[PDB]
Amino acid sequence: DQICIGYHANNSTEKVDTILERNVTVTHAKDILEKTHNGKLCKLNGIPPLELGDCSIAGWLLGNPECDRLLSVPEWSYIMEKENPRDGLCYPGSFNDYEELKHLLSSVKHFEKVKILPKDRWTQHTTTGGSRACAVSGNPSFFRNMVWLTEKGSNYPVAKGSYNNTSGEQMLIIWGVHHPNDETEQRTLYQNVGTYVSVGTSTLNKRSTPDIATRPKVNGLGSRMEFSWTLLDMWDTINFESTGNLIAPEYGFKISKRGSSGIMKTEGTLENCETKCQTPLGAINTTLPFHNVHPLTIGECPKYVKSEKLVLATGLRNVPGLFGAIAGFIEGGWQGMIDGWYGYHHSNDQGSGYAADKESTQKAFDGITNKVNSVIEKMNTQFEAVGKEFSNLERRLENLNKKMEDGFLDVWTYNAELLVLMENERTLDFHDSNVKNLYDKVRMQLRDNVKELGNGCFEFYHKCDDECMNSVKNGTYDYPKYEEES
Amino acid sequence: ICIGYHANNSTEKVDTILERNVTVTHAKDILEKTHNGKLCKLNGIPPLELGDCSIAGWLLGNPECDRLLSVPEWSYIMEKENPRDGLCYPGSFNDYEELKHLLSSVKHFEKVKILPKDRWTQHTTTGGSRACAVSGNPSFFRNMVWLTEKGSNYPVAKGSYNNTSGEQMLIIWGVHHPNDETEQRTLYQNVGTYVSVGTSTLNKRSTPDIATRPKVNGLGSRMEFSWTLLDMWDTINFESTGNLIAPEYGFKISKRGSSGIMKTEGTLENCETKCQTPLGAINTTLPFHNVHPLTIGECPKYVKSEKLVLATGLRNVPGLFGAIAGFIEGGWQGMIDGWYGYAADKESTQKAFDGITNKVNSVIEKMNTQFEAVGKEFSNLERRLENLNKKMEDGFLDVWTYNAELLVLMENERTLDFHDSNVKNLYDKVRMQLRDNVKEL
Amino acid sequence: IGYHANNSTEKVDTILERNVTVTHAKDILEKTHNGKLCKLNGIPPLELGDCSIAGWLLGNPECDRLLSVPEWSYIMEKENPRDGLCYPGSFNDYEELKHLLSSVKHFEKVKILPKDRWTQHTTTGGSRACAVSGNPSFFRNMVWLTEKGSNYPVAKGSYNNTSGEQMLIIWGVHHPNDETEQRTLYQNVGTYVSVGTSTLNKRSTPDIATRPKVNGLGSRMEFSWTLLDMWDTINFESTGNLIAPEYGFKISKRGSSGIMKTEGTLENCETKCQTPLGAINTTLPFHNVHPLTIGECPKYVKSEKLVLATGLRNVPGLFGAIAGFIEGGWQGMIDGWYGYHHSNDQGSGYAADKESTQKAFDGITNKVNSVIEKMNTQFEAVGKEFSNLERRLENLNKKMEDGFLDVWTYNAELLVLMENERTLDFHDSNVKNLYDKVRMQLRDNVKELGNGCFEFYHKCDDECMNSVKNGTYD
Numbered sequence A: 001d002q003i004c005i006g007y008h009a010n011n012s013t014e015k016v017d018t019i020l021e022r023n024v025t026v027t028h029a030k031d032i033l034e035k036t037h038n039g040k041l042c043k044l045n046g047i048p049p050l051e052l053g054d055c056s057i058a059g060w061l062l063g064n065p066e067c068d069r070l071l072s073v074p075e076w077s078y079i080m081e082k083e084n085p086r087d088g089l090c091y092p093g094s095f096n097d098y099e100e101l102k103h104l105l106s107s108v109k110h111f112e113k114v115k116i117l118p119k120d121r122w123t124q125h126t127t128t129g130g131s132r133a134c135a136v137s138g139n140p141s142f143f144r145n146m147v148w149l150t151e152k153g154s155n156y157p158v159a160k161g162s163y164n165n166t167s168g169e170q171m172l173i174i175w176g177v178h179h180p181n182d183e184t185e186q187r188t189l190y191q192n193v194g195t196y197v198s199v200g201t202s203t204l205n206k207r208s209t210p211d212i213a214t215r216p217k218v219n220g221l222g223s224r225m226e227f228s229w230t231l232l233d234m235w236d237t238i239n240f241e242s243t244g245n246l247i248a249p250e251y252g253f254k255i256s257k258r259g260s261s262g263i264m265k266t267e268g269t270l271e272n273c274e275t276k277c278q279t280p281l282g283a284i285n286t287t288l289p290f291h292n293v294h295p296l297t298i299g300e301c302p303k304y305v306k307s308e309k310l311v312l313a314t315g316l317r318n319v320p321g322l323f324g325a326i327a328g329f330i331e332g333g334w335q336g337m338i339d340g341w342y343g344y345h346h347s348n349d350q351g352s353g354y355a356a357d358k359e360s361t362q363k364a365f366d367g368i369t370n371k372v373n374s375v376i377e378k379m380n381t382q383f384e385a386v387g388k389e390f391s392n393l394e395r396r397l398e399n400l401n402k403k404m405e406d407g408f409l410d411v412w413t414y415n416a417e418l419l420v421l422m423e424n425e426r427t428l429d430f431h432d433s434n435v436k437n438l439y440d441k442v443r444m445q446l447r448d449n450v451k452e453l454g455n456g457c458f459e460f461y462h463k464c465d466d467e468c469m470n471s472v473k474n475g476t477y478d479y480p481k482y483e484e485e486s
Numbered sequence B: 001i002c003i004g005y006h007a008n009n010s011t012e013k014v015d016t017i018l019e020r021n022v023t024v025t026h027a028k029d030i031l032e033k034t035h036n037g038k039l040c041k042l043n044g045i046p047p048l049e050l051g052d053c054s055i056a057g058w059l060l061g062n063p064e065c066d067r068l069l070s071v072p073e074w075s076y077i078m079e080k081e082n083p084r085d086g087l088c089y090p091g092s093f094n095d096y097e098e099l100k101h102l103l104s105s106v107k108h109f110e111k112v113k114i115l116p117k118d119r120w121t122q123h124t125t126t127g128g129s130r131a132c133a134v135s136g137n138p139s140f141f142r143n144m145v146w147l148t149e150k151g152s153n154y155p156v157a158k159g160s161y162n163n164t165s166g167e168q169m170l171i172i173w174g175v176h177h178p179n180d181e182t183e184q185r186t187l188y189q190n191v192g193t194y195v196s197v198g199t200s201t202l203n204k205r206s207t208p209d210i211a212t213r214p215k216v217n218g219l220g221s222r223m224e225f226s227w228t229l230l231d232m233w234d235t236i237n238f239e240s241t242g243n244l245i246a247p248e249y250g251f252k253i254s255k256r257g258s259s260g261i262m263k264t265e266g267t268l269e270n271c272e273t274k275c276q277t278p279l280g281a282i283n284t285t286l287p288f289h290n291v292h293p294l295t296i297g298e299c300p301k302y303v304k305s306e307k308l309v310l311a312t313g314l315r316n317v318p319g320l321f322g323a324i325a326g327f328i329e330g331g332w333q334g335m336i337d338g339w340y341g342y343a344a345d346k347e348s349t350q351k352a353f354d355g356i357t358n359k360v361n362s363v364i365e366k367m368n369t370q371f372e373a374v375g376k377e378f379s380n381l382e383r384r385l386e387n388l389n390k391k392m393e394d395g396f397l398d399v400w401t402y403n404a405e406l407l408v409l410m411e412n413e414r415t416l417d418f419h420d421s422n423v424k425n426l427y428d429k430v431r432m433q434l435r436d437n438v439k440e441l
Numbered sequence C: 001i002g003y004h005a006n007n008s009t010e011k012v013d014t015i016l017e018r019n020v021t022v023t024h025a026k027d028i029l030e031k032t033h034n035g036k037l038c039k040l041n042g043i044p045p046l047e048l049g050d051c052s053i054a055g056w057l058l059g060n061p062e063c064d065r066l067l068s069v070p071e072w073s074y075i076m077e078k079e080n081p082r083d084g085l086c087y088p089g090s091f092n093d094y095e096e097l098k099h100l101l102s103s104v105k106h107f108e109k110v111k112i113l114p115k116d117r118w119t120q121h122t123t124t125g126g127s128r129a130c131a132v133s134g135n136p137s138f139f140r141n142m143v144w145l146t147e148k149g150s151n152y153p154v155a156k157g158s159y160n161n162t163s164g165e166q167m168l169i170i171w172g173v174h175h176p177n178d179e180t181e182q183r184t185l186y187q188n189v190g191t192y193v194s195v196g197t198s199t200l201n202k203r204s205t206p207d208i209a210t211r212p213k214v215n216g217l218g219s220r221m222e223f224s225w226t227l228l229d230m231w232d233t234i235n236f237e238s239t240g241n242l243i244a245p246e247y248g249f250k251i252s253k254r255g256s257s258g259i260m261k262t263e264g265t266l267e268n269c270e271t272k273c274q275t276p277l278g279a280i281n282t283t284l285p286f287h288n289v290h291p292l293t294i295g296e297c298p299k300y301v302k303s304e305k306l307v308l309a310t311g312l313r314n315v316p317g318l319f320g321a322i323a324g325f326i327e328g329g330w331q332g333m334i335d336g337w338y339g340y341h342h343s344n345d346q347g348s349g350y351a352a353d354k355e356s357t358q359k360a361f362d363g364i365t366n367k368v369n370s371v372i373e374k375m376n377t378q379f380e381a382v383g384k385e386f387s388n389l390e391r392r393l394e395n396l397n398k399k400m401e402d403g404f405l406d407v408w409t410y411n412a413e414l415l416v417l418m419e420n421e422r423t424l425d426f427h428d429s430n431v432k433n434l435y436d437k438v439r440m441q442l443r444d445n446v447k448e449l450g451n452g453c454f455e456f457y458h459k460c461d462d463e464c465m466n467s468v469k470n471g472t473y474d
């Protein structure tokens, strides 16, 4: 008669690494590194992204005619722009503090255009000036949202125009100053020569004089338009005053935020799925602590890491350690045991059998669960934008960001790598111990009444029927008997 | 003879990688969460208290900022969120954030008269404004001087100052932007005016901007202040045909190091600290805290946790080695001398208490801690710079939290196992001696 | 059953103890340099000597002794360079320029507005502030357009960039001390300097005012720069006060490095990691040589030692074998970490257990290797450049650099500590398992002494012994 102590072993080929070994085969394993996406650009926490198509934020805001096909939502959560957008400043020039503007617009709670200096009211000034650089149908046109004030009659009276912001939200307002190619152009557009463009608020005070000079031709244009912007507060007013060269707004933009997102560079288009974490390659949907999909994410994302696999062993070493039981003094595992991780055999005259030890396999499965769950749910995860915008005179600011983004990459990678490695030698040892303790718990009961074979089995001197066996696995067994002895 | 382990009446719970809600005999918390609700001196030196004033209001001499204490040496700055008294006269202050950063912590700071008001003969020196009113009557930033037309003549205003006070000197100046060409004339006569400021390093020329504006404090005009740091033995040259708001005083400034501005409603209180938060002052040897993210001084790592508890004693039983709560079913309340015993085993309880000591001490004293400001200042055209700081401050938050959480968790399954082993080794040390002469129950 | 013990005095620390002596140990903290400034990944650094980037580019006469490579990987500048703007003034967006020039793939000067062609303008103006041999001179690379005859015609000059690479171009605007100087240099008074490209549009008027004298000069020169694109043109136009370029700079990059402040000179050695104290050459994960590095460097940490135990506790734990129920180690055993003794009537002996010492040495190898080769390492510059109106940007960088210092230090410290209590326990276990593997075989036929030895009842000749170490025996 006999009773044995053994551990599970299936047909798995899953490999994990531990601090001390590598290519170690285990019965079951969990991967905690997310690497898959749904190849779609999506709504972020339920709200869509502003799709710009081929347009740039500047082109959109200014009303480039080439940007008319734009959807124009009231509320968006990030911005889809392209790398190198085709239609921006149709009329050559520049946009002051442009990055900051995009950062602002990167995520809006409510955003609505409103007419604030209607085109008609500029009597005493020519209002219809366009340019073939903004051509709609071969004919000269102009940024829809703006107005090109030029000489009327042969007289450019001091252009004055203000606007009290009453729409009950902060208002974004953009304006411009035109830089002619030559003093003639300046005159045949404005009459005056010593001109200036003056913009003021409770907070702003900016005066600009135009720069008349020859320049390389852009879209056949040597002249330039320099746009600036401010955020007109609630109940505050904005005062325009100019003797020429002002490109004034027709429209404002009520804007309410909310929070702050970022601009996502991509060729793709919105697609009507959901996500809490969007990449330029697609959307991530995971509970996992780490991923390697793409560094430029937006939303609540896992830690981006430079790894290809991060695998936790969860089951035991598959054997077709610290305590020397598994693949130790117990040479191999039993495919025959299916109920659980560890258990017994017993060879009787009533029949042979396998039977997992419920209590020990339970206490273990629960533990390994806490482990995996711990590695996963202790990870703090907030909402970030990552991808960022910097000008050409900001290569250092940009590089400071990169030094920082890299720093965290290195830190998270080294940790997640070693976390898996260290936690894995522990897990195996854990299983090994459990078995070794299960072995010892029987050896200590049986004591004198069994030969200790050494393969992890015990050969009973006395006969040990089913009931008896069950007492050995019970915790009963005793012992008085004695027998033998004889 | 018996082999057993200690077990008191504790209810203290810790978590381990493998289990949670585990009860241990004794435990240490390494997360600091308490403050003394006071704003305090930092490393012995006080903070500049601004009260309702803004740094700008203070420096320019807003009349509303006269009640200010004005120490010679401070270690941080107490400002409010939305200070009532700043630029009484509407306008702006160039490179303001940078200035605040500079002034955030001074080793020595002392006002000195450098272009005395009197000496501006040939210029009217007494101009004020009801926007800076003291007692219904028009007044003006005390530290500044409003040069205006005298007689009906504004001669080229010239004034220089050689810095001899043997310290770097902060100097602030201004350019007035009138509401209309009339105001400009009835203040300065001239129309094509400019304000010129120069040093060995500085060269700035400004023309005033005459334009209509929204009224602020009933004022459409504006004042635009700029500043420089005049070096030792260097000179500053003012020159102007109008619209210059020149300084009467400079500020000798020596630093030292660098602190930061702390936003708070509260007032200084005469306690000490090496670590100040807006909620109060922290006093701890602990490696982590969650008091408030905006700290100044030598602080523990700010972490997003509520508890971080190290088990130190053993599992309380009223593991890897299967002794504790294992083949030895329970603990003895009867044993009081130490952790394990038969009468506690002095040598084994000692070697263990020493070990668990090294553990806790190691977790605590390996933490590198330097002096930082955290809270920071950024303008409106700096929302990105600001956001870059937040992405970074968050990044570290996530890193430290994830680590401290798991550190506690991992180090706790180890500690218990440690105890378990010690017992099991104590048991084996006896079983191996006794051998043949005892029944092994 | 016993374990190895040599004559080592090497000490490591563990979570639970300190000053623990082990048989063998590995240090993973690099602290040594070769005291040389070196080529970085095969390419040399631009050596500036006493010159500043500005002095170099503008052609300060004092900067003629410069080597001038076509391709460099970092820049050697000094803290407080003697020769920069010989003529007092300033340089707009200077930091950014240095950052750009910090590392070039190809860099070559080319004449783009030859001095001669400025007829109708005096081209020979110098200054004793840029004196070569007591005589007035001027930035070699620049040209001081001044009145010719008594007439300063509108100065015009353009240049189409055809050299097939981005071109750096620097220009200047002169700020006279007084309206007289302005006239006796340019005739005109309402002057302006105008510079344009497809992207640039800058107009500057000179500032005439009195100033503290620098190099006996109250006047000032204010230089600005742009990056003229391929096939783009740059248009100068000026009625006075323009200090125009004679030369451009073809520039191609590549990547991005940084400026290294040092007194020393290039030396013809190699490195992938350069510090201001010398060059690092290591596979180690951490170092404490100096924080301002350039290249692929280990993590800079605030430690003095970071030592992994690798061999076992030297005894002249969790499992209670080493320094436990087996009181000491055997100097007699040399073959490996653990093994047996056996006292026979054919002779005594020592003999390490090959299979167990192997499996262990392999493991401890994976450990060290793992700590070392999982460390992600990229190329960075660290040291950085910020102006005086950037004390915040600078401080933001310091808060960040510190942040990582604290993080890496706390981790490497604890990594070593934790991994070391594990390593010792590991050895302890291996022994204890070796002991149990024999006890389980021998069973009934031996008295179990208790010192880690077994006394055979039956006689156990050589063959027999070998069966005990075999795995046979029966």
Ligand SMILES: CC(=O)N[C@H]1[C@H]([C@H](O)[C@H](O)CO)O[C@@](O)(C(=O)O)C[C@@H]1O
Pocket: C125, C126, C127, C128, C129, C136, C146, C176, C177, C181, C182, C184, C185, C219
């Ligand atoms: C006139 C000219 O082109 N260069 C002359 C300058 C300039 O007049 C002033 O530096 C500009 O204000 O004056 C010098 O005395 C000088 O600087 O050494 C001599 C030099 O030949």
